[PDB]
């Protein structure tokens, strides 16, 4: 099993929608610094050697645990193509 996937599949129209959402989320979450997360204070994924999952082990786990809360919104067209790419690299390292 995975972090509440039934909530995730129901969360979208098609099952593939969820996959693309999660994927792209992970991508931007890794490319523009792992800081642009939407649940980093206390309710966040952790690991077992140290609690150091707080930085950058897995990309997808984060995306799935994030979507679980109403912090992100998917959809067809939301933001202009280039502008998004620009500002998402500006606001973060």
């Amino acid at each position: 099993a995975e972090p509440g996937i039934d909530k995730l599949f129901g969360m979208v129209d098609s099952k593939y929608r969820l996959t693309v959402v999660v994927a792209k989320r992970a991508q931007q979450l890794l490319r523009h610094g792992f800081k642009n997360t939407v649940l980093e204070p206390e309710e966040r994924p952790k690991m077992q050697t140290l609690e150091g999952l707080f930085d950058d082990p897995n990309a997808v786990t984060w995306a799935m645990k994030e979507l679980l809360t109403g912090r992100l919104v998917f959809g067809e067209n939301l933001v202009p193509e280039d502008r998004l790419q620009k500002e998402m690299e500006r606001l973060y390292p």
Partner: protein
Amino acid sequence: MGVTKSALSTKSWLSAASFQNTTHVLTEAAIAGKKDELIGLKENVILGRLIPAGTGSDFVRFTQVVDQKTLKAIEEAR
């Protein structure tokens, strides 16, 4: 018509170029400006492009996701 007889004559020449006699599927389709509608999987796989289904479906392929921290920044100069 039979299943193999069916698939023997798909419009998309890209597909028939693999199974059927290639030199023929190309010679015959060349004389008539045949638009290969890149839709069939087998057809669209010979090239490399993501298969037109699942995570590659147009209905899903073009989707974005953002948070409010960026949504606001974009919201301003809109």
